[PDB]
Design a protein around this nucleic acid. Sequence first.
RNA 1: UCUCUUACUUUUAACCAGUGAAAUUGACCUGCCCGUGAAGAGGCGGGCAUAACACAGCAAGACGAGAAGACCCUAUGGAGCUUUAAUUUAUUAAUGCAAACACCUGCAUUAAAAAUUUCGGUUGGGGCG
RNA 2: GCCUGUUUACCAAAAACAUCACCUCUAGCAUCACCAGUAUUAGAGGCACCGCCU
RNA 3: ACUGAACUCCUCACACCCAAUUGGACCAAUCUAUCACCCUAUAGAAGAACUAAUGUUAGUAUAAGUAACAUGAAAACAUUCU
RNA 4: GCUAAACCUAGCCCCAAACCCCACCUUACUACCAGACAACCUUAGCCAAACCAUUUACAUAAAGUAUAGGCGAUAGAAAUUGAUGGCGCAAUAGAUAUAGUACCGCAAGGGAAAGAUGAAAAACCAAGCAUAAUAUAGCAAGGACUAACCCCUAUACCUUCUGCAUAAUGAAUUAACUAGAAAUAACUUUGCAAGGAGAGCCAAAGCUAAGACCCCCGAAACCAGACGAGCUACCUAAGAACAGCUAAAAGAGCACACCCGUCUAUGUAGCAAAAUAGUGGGAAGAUUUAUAGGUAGAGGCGACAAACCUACCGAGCCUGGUGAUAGCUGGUUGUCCAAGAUAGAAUCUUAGUUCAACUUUAAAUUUGCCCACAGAACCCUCUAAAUCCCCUU
Lengths: 166, 95, 190, 243, 19, 148, 97, 117
Amino acid sequence: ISRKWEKKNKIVYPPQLPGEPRRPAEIYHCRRQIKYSKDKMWYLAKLIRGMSIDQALAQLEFNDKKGAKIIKEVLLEAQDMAVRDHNVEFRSNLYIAESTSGRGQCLKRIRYHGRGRFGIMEKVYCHYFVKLVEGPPPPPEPPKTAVAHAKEYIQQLRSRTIVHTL
Amino acid sequence: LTYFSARKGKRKTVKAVIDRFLRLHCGLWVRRKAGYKKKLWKKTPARKKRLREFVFCNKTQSKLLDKMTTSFWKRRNWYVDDPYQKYHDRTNLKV
Amino acid sequence: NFKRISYAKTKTRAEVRGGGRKPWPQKGTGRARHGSIRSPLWRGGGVAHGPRGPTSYYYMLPMKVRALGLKVALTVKLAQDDLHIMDSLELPTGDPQYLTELAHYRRWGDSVLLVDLTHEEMPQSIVEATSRLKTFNLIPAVGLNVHSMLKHQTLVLTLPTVAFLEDKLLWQDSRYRPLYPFSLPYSDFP
Amino acid sequence: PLHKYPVWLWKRLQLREGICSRLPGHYLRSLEEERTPTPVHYRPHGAKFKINPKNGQRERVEDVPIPIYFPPESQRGLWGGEGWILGQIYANNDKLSKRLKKVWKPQLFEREFYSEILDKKFTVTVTMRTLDLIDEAYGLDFYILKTPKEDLCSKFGMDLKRGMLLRLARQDPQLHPEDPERRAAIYDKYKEFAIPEEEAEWVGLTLEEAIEKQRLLEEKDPVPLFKIYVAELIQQLQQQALS
Amino acid sequence: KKRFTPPIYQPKFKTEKEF
Amino acid sequence: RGHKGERQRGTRPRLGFEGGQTPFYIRIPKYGFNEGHSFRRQYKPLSLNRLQYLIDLGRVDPSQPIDLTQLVNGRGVTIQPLKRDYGVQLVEEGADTFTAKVNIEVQLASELAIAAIEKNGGVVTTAFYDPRSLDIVCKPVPFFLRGQ
Amino acid sequence: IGIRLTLPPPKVVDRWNEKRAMFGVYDNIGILGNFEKHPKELIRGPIWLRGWKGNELQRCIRKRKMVGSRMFADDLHNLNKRIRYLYKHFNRHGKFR
Amino acid sequence: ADRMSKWTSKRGPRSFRGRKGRGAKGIGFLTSGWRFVQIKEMVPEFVVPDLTGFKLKPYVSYLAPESEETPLTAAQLFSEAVAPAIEKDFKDNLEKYGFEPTQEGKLFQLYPRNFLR
RNA sequence: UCUCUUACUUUUAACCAGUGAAAUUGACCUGCCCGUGAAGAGGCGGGCAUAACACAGCAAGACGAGAAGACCCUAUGGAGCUUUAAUUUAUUAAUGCAAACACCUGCAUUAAAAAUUUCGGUUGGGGCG
RNA sequence: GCCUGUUUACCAAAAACAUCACCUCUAGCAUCACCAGUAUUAGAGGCACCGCCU
RNA sequence: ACUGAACUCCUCACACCCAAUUGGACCAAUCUAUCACCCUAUAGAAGAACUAAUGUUAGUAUAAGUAACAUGAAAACAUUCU
RNA sequence: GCUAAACCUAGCCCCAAACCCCACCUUACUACCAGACAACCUUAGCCAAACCAUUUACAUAAAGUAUAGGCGAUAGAAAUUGAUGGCGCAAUAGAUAUAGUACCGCAAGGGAAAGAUGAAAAACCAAGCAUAAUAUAGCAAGGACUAACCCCUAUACCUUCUGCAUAAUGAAUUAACUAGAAAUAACUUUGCAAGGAGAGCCAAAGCUAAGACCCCCGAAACCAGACGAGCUACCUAAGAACAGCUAAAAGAGCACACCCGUCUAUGUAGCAAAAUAGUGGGAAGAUUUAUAGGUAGAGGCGACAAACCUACCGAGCCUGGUGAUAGCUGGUUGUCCAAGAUAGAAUCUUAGUUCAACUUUAAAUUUGCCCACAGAACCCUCUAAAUCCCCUU
Ligand SMILES: Nc1nc2c(ncn2[C@@H]2O[C@H](COP(=O)(O)OP(=O)(O)OP(=O)(O)O)[C@@H](O)[C@H]2O)c(=O)[nH]1
Ligand SMILES: [Mg+2]
Ligand SMILES: [Mg+2]
Ligand SMILES: [Mg+2]
Ligand SMILES: [Mg+2]
Ligand SMILES: [Mg+2]
Ligand SMILES: [Mg+2]
Ligand SMILES: [Mg+2]
Ligand SMILES: [Mg+2]
Ligand SMILES: [Mg+2]
Ligand SMILES: [Mg+2]
Ligand SMILES: [Mg+2]
Ligand SMILES: [Mg+2]
Ligand SMILES: [Mg+2]
Ligand SMILES: [Mg+2]
Ligand SMILES: [Mg+2]
Ligand SMILES: [Mg+2]
Ligand SMILES: [Mg+2]
Ligand SMILES: [Mg+2]
Ligand SMILES: [Mg+2]
Ligand SMILES: [Mg+2]
Ligand SMILES: [Mg+2]
Ligand SMILES: [Mg+2]
Ligand SMILES: [Mg+2]
Ligand SMILES: [Mg+2]
Ligand SMILES: [Mg+2]
Ligand SMILES: [Mg+2]
Ligand SMILES: [Mg+2]
Ligand SMILES: [Mg+2]
Ligand SMILES: [Mg+2]
Ligand SMILES: [Mg+2]
Ligand SMILES: [Mg+2]
Ligand SMILES: [Mg+2]
Ligand SMILES: [Mg+2]
Ligand SMILES: [Mg+2]
Ligand SMILES: [Mg+2]
Ligand SMILES: [Mg+2]
Ligand SMILES: [Mg+2]
Ligand SMILES: [Mg+2]
Ligand SMILES: [Mg+2]
Ligand SMILES: [Mg+2]
Ligand SMILES: [Mg+2]
Ligand SMILES: [Mg+2]
Ligand SMILES: [Mg+2]
Ligand SMILES: [Mg+2]
Ligand SMILES: [Mg+2]
Ligand SMILES: [Mg+2]
């Protein structure tokens, strides 16, 4: 097994110079061996990607999926450790930069079928990962306007060369 | 044939070959013509004379007989009075 | 090679434990056809073409060929200036340091094969000196061999060993084809 | 791995180790010796060499005995080395015909014989070969005493031999009591076969019977250590008093 | 004739394994 | 290995089989070409040329009676008693240029060989040797080591 | 993934231990010792292949002939079966015939 | 179908369960009517001594000397028991000294042992 | 039942939550028409069509999945059965001759019972001819 | 198809098998079946109640 | 008239396009003998090389988050009701 | 960054040497009563003979010789001679083995998987996915291009075949494992040479030594010895069940329990390796059923359906012979170059094989191909393209 996500919290950056932008705090948290399918967990992860901590908690509190409660607990733990250990000043000033689900260690069981035949059940387990970044959530990527899209087309037109000649 | 005998691990000789063919040390195999003792009343004198003769074998037939007989049968035999003594070696043979 | 006896053996599908029953019927299962769980294909099955039994690699070169090989080895050493003849192998002392220093001073090789006429009469000094060394090896005249002569950079011989080798190797030249093994009595062979 | 000894020597090794080792030497030698039985069901070759007609050359000829099966009922009787021939035949005596399993059995007759040495009438299932052998030997006693084990081929026959030999060795007065002259006449008639009683006891005993006999001979209730210690102490005190 | 192939049961330990 | 058939499967019929047609080596009648071969006596030839060569090179000493033992010791002939060799036969080859005077004992001899030996002042006698005596005389030292 | 992620432990071979240093000695015992001993007598190993060589069938036949009586029961059964199979293979199967 | 579990009286039909025991030694026999006659002489009678006044507590004081182990032997017993009388009567019929030719006739026969423990 | 089907209830079903298989699977960025071709195209030629994706139905095709077709032919491949197929009577039952003074043994003959093995090829597929 | 019953457990329950009844053949006899029986008995079979014909 | 090949020419180089089969030159990795010492050389050996056998074992996919599975109701979770 | 990846030693393989308290046969592991009952008896078959039937192997040298043999596939002597570890494996390997354990089967019997820290714990890489779904069009690539696609070209692979994109076979994919063994005679290279070889054997340049030289899986089967009558067929012993109504001592009627399974529907990886619901036959008898026992495979049993005999009985199951055999199918793993498609005969033979033909390699020698005249038949009155032979070139 691999446990690099936990280790990611132990990297210490060199002290920043006075004339340097303040580095946003990054907190890596995870929960391992959740009795839940990673495919089902991925939907919740994708839902909360890119949102503020408070918005993600609010969305999860009112979601009927089992994984929602687990993700809410993980997010609360991440917030607590960010405030206590990673010198994050405000609880709410955190956004989910990364949220993914990974395959866990799964157990194999037998499903009995009708004619002495069988299938191999998989007691599925999944991991859950979160990175919380300090600061307001990055603004959503604006849809590209007609002006920008036509500008791209004209750039493509200008990029044309006389191919296969001097 | 038996390439490796179960008791000695050696190559065996097919005695059917020894009972029918004569090997000349030069490598030629001598044989009698089939049917030389059969229905001689209906065969003509010339046919009988042809059948009463000792005949050599093809190259492939000689190779087959050599494979079916072991080295002991290809040795040089200095028999007392061998009727085929003079035929054991070739003379004035080019290629 | 001629002394080599490889002791590598693998169990064939007949010798692997079990594998007597047919794993499943020929037809109707929808699986590959099989006749035993110990065929070469299966995990834990036999080895189709593996090392079989203790195998010997014994073969004898003609004694004339081997004697000629010894002669050629001696000529190569002499021509390449690795052969050193001695009056005797008597050392002033049994200290291996003396022998190593002598070899270094005389610019001998890293490895020296010293040869004496017979094992019994080998001097005690040289016996002690070479018993503790690894690259200096003392052998009787009867032990000379091409492999050792090549493995050792220099070959040290004594005058009686030279005479012994000359006689033994030259006899092969001008000897008859054997009537019977030379161990048996002959008119003039010791 | 490989056994230290060939498997065919294991019985001999067992003979050399254990109670079999303590068995008497003569009995062990009698067990070891393996003289070939007299031909019964095959005609032996006249000589060791024969001029084969095919090529007119002198070739060595060997007598290969025909395997004989002795049913257990034989050991209760006297078959003159005769037994069941369990073999095969070619139907109509041509090798190109079917091969069939054939058992040839001897003709067994129930007869009564008088043993002069044993002075007892024995009813025995017997073969005509055994009757002819008895006639040749000039009596049942002579046949029993002359015939070796490998030709007699009968546990009952060997037991009769043991009884006769034991009576000869002991010169038992139980042979025709109140008739010493007749007893002496019989013993003198069968004198030449007399052997020591020690050997006669073990004559004709199977290996298991010999083992049991030796065990019964050497079975001794352990001597109490009281007696041994008393003897040792008495001897030591005697030495102290003497010196 | 009637062609029937009996079902083959896999060894139990494979599905009974535990962490 | 080819494509299918018996050849690729490694199951082609035995040597001499002709696919079912009566084989060549079986459709030829049996004749006594080699009948009694193991009982025919064989005599190694010893040409007078070979004898003169040996005498000239000193491998056979003509000053002493020459017999099978001396010929074998000089390596003039190689006798194989186990291969039904019964000795050595003198051969007229080289008679014209034979000049050595020798007392040679052989097993067989030709009239011309005898004539040459006698003309050169020598003596020739034909002596029989049964297989055991022949083996002993050809290799006396092994016999002496047998201790018989 | 069938490749190890670490270098194997260094393998040190003493080229001048006693065995290597004296290897080959007395291989010329015959020619250099009045032929009192044949070099094949220097071969230490199984009794049935001391100074003898052959294919698998020949080796099995020799093993059964020389030590078969001293072999274990199942080992001897295996040797008999191997001899049978090798006989069939060498005398009935092959490209050349 | 269970072969690896020990065969006990708890397994089997009524007859098996009744017939098999648990190792307890028999105390009597069964007569007609399945009436059990208990024999008193077959009941082990614990010969318990009178511990009043006994001075040997179960444990030994740690302040006790350590002595070499000397397993008693037949020779040692003979020397300590019989040898004195043998010497005395030698200076001055082994039954008088103590030897018993046969264990038969005794309540406690040494061989074959006929007493418990 | 049907002309001629309709209405409702339960299960199923669809959505939400938990748990969670199976056959199958060369890779697929997996369209229609005509023609072609190993003789019936999603993939080739000529045309036509064509932003990307889910969800629910359908069963026309993927010569769809499933069982190395049970039909048919072949194999000097098997096996079951029947016989006036070939070879035997080892086995029993009878007899007859020996051997012994009815039984047993040996040798023959006759039956029952069986046993081992085979059942050619060409062939406008095979059979018949 | 007389009938009640039996059968291809897992595609055939039937007109198939059995069946009382009838018919054919064999057997004159005891200590392990037949049978602790003895020709009105036992066994091996065919067909299928009964009734009428041939 | 033009277009049009791997035909031919052109500049350089040439052993570098037939199934079964056959001849030959090299060679990955392993061990052994001597070298070598950040990966090797000369030789001797051999369980010496896998895009394919409804191949064997193990892992993980597709079908698929699909087919299927489950807890009568309220409540003080005492109890009651259907 | 998750699943995961690796690892070194647990042991094993081949040789040498050496010979190796109590309980328990009754229902085993059960303290404690009149026994009697005791064992020897040819292997067969597969397979080869291309069928099969006689037959078919179970120190060196003589010798694969004498002999045997449907004299054929093949079998095969004797006299005589003298006789100290690893160019092994290293957890799919090596023993099956961490274990004959778990698990499976009534039983015989079958039979696994796996572990990896450190001196001390009293201290980056397979597949699959996710980061990060997707844009018109097409074996998914190549030529390219400023530019991923757009443009043009391109009918996956293997096997099999006359011919496959084929809608013929195999393959989900990754890792690991998984398949050419050898004589005779030749060829090359040495040694020695009328001799070679370390007895035997060969020799009219031979001989000695070396190099090179022939696969894997798969049947239905056959035989031997065990194991099976807790299912089922029948039987033996001693038991049990059969309401109610009509009739009356019933192989009687209706109809419960019970037994069976006519028909339909559902189900068809099912609740079920034969079931559920309804419907239906019997249901005091030749009935049904519990218990213990018996008949065992050249067999048993059978109200014959070639039924049933532990889920798959035209003849059980397990083990062994056994790596059965298969002219049949499938598979047969590094690079590169070269030569290479070709008449027929025989054959229980046409799905194969031997010979020929063709093909390949090496060697010796001299003619090879193309082809000028001249020349090669009458029957038949006429009559084709041509062919053979053939110097020159
Ligand atoms: N080939 C081989 N040699 C062995 C074997 N076991 C031991 N040896 C050798 O036996 C010799 C002595 O073994 P050691 O263990 O050193 O001494 P030991 O205990 O006196 O030996 P043994 O008497 O053999 O038990 C050495 O040369 C070992 O190599 C083995 O299995 N095979
Ligand atoms: Mg799954
Ligand atoms: Mg096996
Ligand atoms: Mg098989
Ligand atoms: Mg293994
Ligand atoms: Mg193929
Ligand atoms: Mg073919
Ligand atoms: Mg024919
Ligand atoms: Mg759901
Ligand atoms: Mg079309
Ligand atoms: Mg859809
Ligand atoms: Mg549908
Ligand atoms: Mg398609
Ligand atoms: Mg289909
Ligand atoms: Mg098919
Ligand atoms: Mg059919
Ligand atoms: Mg057949
Ligand atoms: Mg009816
Ligand atoms: Mg009815
Ligand atoms: Mg019935
Ligand atoms: Mg049915
Ligand atoms: Mg039924
Ligand atoms: Mg039905
Ligand atoms: Mg009927
Ligand atoms: Mg162009
Ligand atoms: Mg390999
Ligand atoms: Mg692979
Ligand atoms: Mg595969
Ligand atoms: Mg899924
Ligand atoms: Mg779906
Ligand atoms: Mg559903
Ligand atoms: Mg055959
Ligand atoms: Mg074949
Ligand atoms: Mg002999
Ligand atoms: Mg293992
Ligand atoms: Mg990856
Ligand atoms: Mg396809
Ligand atoms: Mg096909
Ligand atoms: Mg497929
Ligand atoms: Mg029963
Ligand atoms: Mg009632
Ligand atoms: Mg009724
Ligand atoms: Mg019928
Ligand atoms: Mg039928
Ligand atoms: Mg069954
Ligand atoms: Mg095969
Ligand atoms: Mg080419």
